[PDB]
């Protein structure tokens, strides 16, 4: 929307900027510089741009409810857009080292990073860590004067932190967590106990709803100086629902949407993860289906993963989305009737970012 | 060691900080916490804490040499400890991703946490980054009220960049730099026209230098006030040249250290990466000698691993290195006796990084 033309012209500033400080630093030679402007192109560009766009939205919401000259405009918007590079580039650095967790071979239509055959899972694993390392330099570079570098910091590191929290939470869901020793392997459940609404809902919001949309929002409010205009509570809370819901639909498309239609070929199934499919399932299905979902979960076999498909579309999985949908869009339009109370500047840039949100296809 | 059992301490604290936080924070689980008490313990802990250890022995000379009374040298000396604890996780998530990198055994005399049979690389890449995180969470709780903290996570973040383009150089270096497309598989290099001296200086002076040396030397000013006391060009400088040598001892111990001193297997000749023996070497010894080592270096056969050390000896690198150190030992005594002259109490603070650096064992 409004700010996509403003934004794709700050990636181009803050690349250039990047790589000539690599040069100007590190006496960075023309074909690495070459490589690393190919992996930032590669790891940044070609997702929805819904992170980074929201802390403009946000930014210029804010601004326009402030009284401020054309210069000062300016500068908010600006500010902005490094902002949500510095968000972009963090999920880039996740989706680089998940994709490797996960043994992915698809992401944003193109293969994963790490399958780059001139890059391989060993040059990939320092390619991330560059990445996260670029988002904090360009704060330190574009707000090297700004009053609100410390806590645009401050927020970005506790974020951080947080989805790698949310990741271990994931990775380790389909394991009994009782059995975790760094000196024993363990097999996958066989009995599924942990898989229930408190454990989903735990990794979705750690993994997902802090970074996806608290992180933006936040941003916009620091950035153009209106953090201490808003209710905190209220900005988390809801914040949380969209993130989890977010989440949901994320492990509602890649059982149901077309890898092609998506950019990537989603193996929860195959990897027996925690996905609100599964827990969905294990408490409402009867009995014979649970035992058959467990003998075909967890399994490589494309077979048993049709198996899943038919058990999940044979519970209606869709349906009990939409009524879950249902229920959060109520309660989200009221967290944003009560944030318009409050602060209508604000709720609107809420609004902006929950209508990229509720029934997306991808 | 005059710092040990303090820093010891400051590590239990630190770690129940951490860990009690997450609780707080993310519902973190007990089987969970124990996970990540064990990891903490297992990548952070068995080294020789030179880096941490700096950080408190720089911040306690300079709040000598500025007469601090008791109440302030406890702080000073206290928060010292949790930049020096910042500095140590740093090298712990460092080495958690190097291990995987060079497909390492050993570290510090255990298997590398990758290896560990519960955790595996998939869950030790998300580990890494809990490390790196949880070294930012450091600063932004101890040093909340602390008007260094922006400048402390200015050179963490900075250093830790420079640290990952020190190790892009690293991973490249046995693959032509022209040939550096990410959609085209690299074979190694067989005529080795990349391996010279400027190259490996830029490799280790930035994968190296930069974090073992400079960034502990820096935050133990920063931690004291003093950082305003001392030439910091002189300073930078001889950061780069310890920092150089001691990458130089590490790639001769790579070959000439039993592994079981050393407390890892070194496999530079296996992975025939650009080490200051093979440079050295390749520059020193004939064309017979240089020939026979092309068609045998890059190589995990084990004969052919001796042939190299073989002609390593006959070479006479041992040798060549003493020789080199000489040079070093005559231009760090002259930078130091430049520092002394300026401050007495920071100087005398380097001595005690080089003292613990010139011709250690491990
Ligand atoms: C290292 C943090 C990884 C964080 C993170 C958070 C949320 C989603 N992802 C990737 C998704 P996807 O790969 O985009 O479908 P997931 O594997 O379903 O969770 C990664
Ligand atoms: C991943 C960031 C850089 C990691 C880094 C930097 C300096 C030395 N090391 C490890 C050593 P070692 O593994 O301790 O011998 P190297 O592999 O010889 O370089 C790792
Ligand atoms: C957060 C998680 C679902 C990863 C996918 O995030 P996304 O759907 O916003 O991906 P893009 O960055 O490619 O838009
Ligand atoms: C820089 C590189 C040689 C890394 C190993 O560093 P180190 O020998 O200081 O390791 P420890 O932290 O185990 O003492
Ligand atoms: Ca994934
Ligand atoms: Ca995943
Ligand atoms: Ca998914
Ligand atoms: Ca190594
Ligand atoms: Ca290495
Ligand atoms: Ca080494």
Chains 1, 2 share one sequence.
Not at 89 to 108: C, E, G, N, P, W
Not at 111 to 116: A, I, Q, V
Request: negative net charge; glycine residues 4%.
């Amino acid at each position: 929307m409004a700010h996509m033309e403003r934004f794709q012209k700050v990636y181009e500033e803050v690349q250039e900027f990047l790589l000539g400080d690599a040069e100007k630093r590190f006496e960075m030679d023309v074909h690495r510089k070459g490589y690393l402007k190919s992996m930032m192109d590669t790891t940044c560009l070609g997702g929805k741009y819904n992170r980074g766009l929201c802390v403009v939205d946000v930014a210029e919401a804010m601004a326009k409810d402030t009284q401020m000259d054309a210069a000062a405009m300016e500068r908010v918007l600006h500010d902005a857009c490094v902002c949500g590079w510095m968000i972009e580039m963090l999920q880039a650095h996740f989706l680089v080292y998940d994709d490797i967790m996960d043994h992915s071979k698809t992401r944003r239509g193109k293969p994963c990073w790490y399958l780059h055959p001139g890059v391989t899972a060993q040059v990939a694993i320092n390619d991330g860590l560059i990445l996260l390392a670029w988002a904090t330099q360009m704060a330190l570079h574009y707000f090297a004067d700004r009053p609100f570098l410390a806590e645009v910091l401050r927020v970005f590191h506790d974020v951080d932190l947080t989805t790698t929290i949310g990741q271990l939470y994931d990775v380790t869901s389909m394991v009994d967590s009782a059995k975790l020793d760094a000196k024993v392997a363990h097999a996958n459940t066989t009995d599924y106990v942990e898989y229930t609404p408190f454990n989903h809902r735990r990794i979705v919001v750690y993994k997902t709803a802090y970074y996806t949309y608290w992180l933006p929002l936040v941003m916009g409010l620091l950035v153009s100086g209106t953090l201490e205009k808003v209710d905190k509570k209220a900005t988390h809370k809801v914040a949380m629902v969209m993130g989890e819901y977010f989440q949901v639909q994320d492990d509602v498309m890649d059982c149901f949407t077309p890898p092609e239609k998506l950019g990537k070929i989603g193996t929860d199934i195959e990897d027996a993860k925690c996905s609100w499919l599964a827990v969905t399932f294990l408490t409402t299905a009867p009995a014979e289906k649970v035992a058959e979902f467990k003998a075909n979960y967890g399994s490589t076999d494309p077979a048993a993963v049709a198996v899943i498909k038919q058990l999940y579309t044979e519970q209606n999985l869709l349906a009990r989305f939409e009524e879950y949908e249902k229920a959060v869009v109520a309660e989200v339009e009221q967290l944003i009737a009560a944030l318009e109370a409050q602060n209508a500047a604000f709720a609107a840039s809420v609004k902006v970012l929950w209508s990229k949100t509720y029934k997306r296809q991808k």
